[PDB]
Structure 1
Amino acid sequence: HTLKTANSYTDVTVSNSTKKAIRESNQYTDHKFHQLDNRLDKLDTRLLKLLASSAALNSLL
């Protein structure tokens, strides 16, 4: 029928758009994962050095 066909054009087309919204909304999640994951690696290295020196201190006494 013209229904069946319209109806299954919606089916196909919607299914491809769930898929699209997901792919893209994940992609922006991963933009800002990559953006705070960076500010962390930089805190971890600044803190690494802090543990280094304070191992050096404990050891002088």
Structure 2
Amino acid sequence: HTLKTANSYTDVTVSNSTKKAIRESNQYTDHKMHQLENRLDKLEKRLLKLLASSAALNS
């Protein structure tokens, strides 16, 4: 009786814990990828500048 009840309480709580961990870690991930996306957006705009600048250098 008691062994089965504890082990099932373990199973259900553990399974909720696994979800919460991944949920929270994957949200941190999304947070860091956003920061590197912003950075890549800004790079790409700088490259677009150099492109026009290069074509203008010809002459």
TM-score (norm 2): 0.89
Alpha-carbon displacement from aligned partner over 1:22-58 (angstroms, at most 9, x marks no partner): 0100100111110111011001001111112212334
Residue 36 of structure 1 pairs with residue 36 of structure 2: yes
Corresponding residue SS for 2:58:
helix
* Structure 2: gaps of 5 or more residues: none
Residue 47 of structure 1 pairs with residue 47 of structure 2: yes
Partner Cα distance (1:27, 1:38) in 2: 17
- Give me the CA root mean square deviation: 1.2
The size of the alignment, in residue pairs, is 59
Between the aligned residues of both structures, percent identity stands at 93
Partner Cα distance (1:55, 1:8) in 2: 70
